Design a protein around this ligand. Structure first.
Ligand SMILES: Nc1ncnc2c1ncn2[C@@H]1O[C@H](CSCC[C@H](N)C(=O)O)[C@@H](O)[C@H]1O
Ligand SMILES: Nc1ncnc2c1ncn2[C@@H]1O[C@H](CSCC[C@H](N)C(=O)O)[C@@H](O)[C@H]1O
Ligand SMILES: [Mg+2]
Ligand SMILES: [Mg+2]
Lengths: 242, 242
């Protein structure tokens, strides 16, 4: 209701990790990520860690892994659902070739404007088509208009977690055969391992349930092959088979 | 040579995980791996779990990740250093196209023969050229016979960990530009996060130091881009730049 509003401080899980210690995560970041992180990504990360929804920011080691996947599969056209301040978006734009194209969807353009100066300074703003909207209507609009020549190589899904299964029904048609769909946060702070988990915020409990259902759905889906990867907060890579 | 025993039972770290939660690792395996694991991989894993060097067996969730990488980058010719009973080898042979080829190197073919019946029943033995040898002489011989047109798409490095930096100097010449080298176990039970770690078998301590040195080397190496990934016991993906 009326008041000051929602805080990540209201959330039970924001201090949780899936790795065995903070020291191991910090080792990975300092040894293997920060020396390889573009200066503009570093700047965008540092301002975002002061933001009120900083817990949503994609992990920097996960960022380098997404970049690696994009380059190894020679992706050119991608879609991103859930932009926030733009860390995964700038990661993707830096990884794609000069003529790469990204369709980036987020309900809140004000977050994107936080990262836009870093994206501009990195010289890759020209690859991004940002759409301010709930993602489901955009995807449904694409599906009546897109042709085979416009299919995406890669999709990164990092928006409202309870809608992932609904996004999946559209994305297995919008990503090419042999293309990849990556769902972020599919281990949800480790809570998915438990049929009950005490003391969660109502929205956190909704995601625990939705990810437990989604992980079963993806594992059963004959239209894709999958790999769930314990990096960041967990992600699941899907590769479209037909 | 003479010295102290170095069997798996003499090691300290066998049961340590890099994930905080044994339940979380079990959830990943039960939900996203076992339902997607080839019957012959299951059989090979099960007999290997009973073997005296079971600690060396690649994790099954890591297996599916490697298979995903191979498919997404359309790998066709690969090299594997460190075969053991053949789980990553069978994973790779199943992922490659029907005319794919693997050069598989191990000092001990009796390990390979444990897994060979499963590889044969899977119908993919024909993709494997197994070389019973120390890897370094084989790679040096390859350097003098290999032509530009036969460079490997992908290398998986999982053999004797203190030698990884030596393998790297050959592999950045044996894998094509844009190809991938994957080094297994680069987080070494999480012990790489500390300058010293008490209670280790000397061979375990040697790997801890060699991985701390390797991780710094790879992060500083301009010939590759990298992504260190906290899956299994940790792995580092390298993409050759020139
Ligand atoms: N229905 C919806 N459609 C599109 N975006 C949505 C959405 N619901 C929430 N979002 C957006 O999804 C984002 C999730 S956070 C995304 C993090 C970002 N990918 C990174 O690299 O850090 C938020 O910016 C939120 O505004
Ligand atoms: N110098 C060397 N050259 C080649 N292989 C070696 C080696 N030293 C040890 N090895 C082999 O490296 C293997 C490491 S265990 C490999 C695990 C396997 N890839 C899996 O998927 O489970 C052992 O089989 C060991 O015999
Ligand atoms: Mg996320
Ligand atoms: Mg290994």
């Amino acid at each position: 209701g009326p008041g000051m509003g929602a805080s990540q401080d209201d959330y039970a899980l924001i201090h949780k990790n899936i790795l065995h210690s903070e020291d191991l995560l910090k080792y990975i970041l300092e040894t293997s990520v920060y020396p390889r992180e573009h200066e503009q990504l570093k700047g965008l990360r540092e301002v975002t860690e002061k933001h009120e929804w900083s817990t949503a920011l994609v992990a920097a080691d996960e960022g380098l892994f997404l970049s690696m996947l994009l380059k190894l599969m020679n992706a050119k056209r991608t879609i991103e659902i859930g932009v926030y301040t733009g860390y995964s978006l700038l990661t993707t734009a830096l990884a794609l070739p000069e003529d790469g194209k990204i369709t980036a969807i987020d309900v809140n353009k004000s977050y994107f404007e936080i990262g836009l100066p870093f994206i501009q300074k990195a010289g890759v703003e020209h690859k991004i088509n940002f759409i301010e909207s709930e993602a489901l209507p955009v995807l449904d609009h694409m599906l009546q208009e897109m042709k085979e020549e416009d299919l995406y190589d890669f999709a990164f899904v990092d928006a409202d977690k309870p809608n992932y299964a609904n996004y999946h029904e559209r994305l297995v048609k919008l990503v090419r055969v042999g293309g990849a769909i990556v769902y972020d946060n599919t281990l949800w702070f480790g809570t998915v391992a438990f049929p009950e988990y005490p003391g969660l915020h109502p929205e956190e409990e909704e995601c625990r349930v939705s990810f437990r259902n989604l992980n079963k759905l993806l594992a059963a889906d004959p239209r894709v092959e999958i790999s769930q990867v314990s990096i960041g907060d967990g992600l699941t890579i899907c590769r479209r088979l037909y």
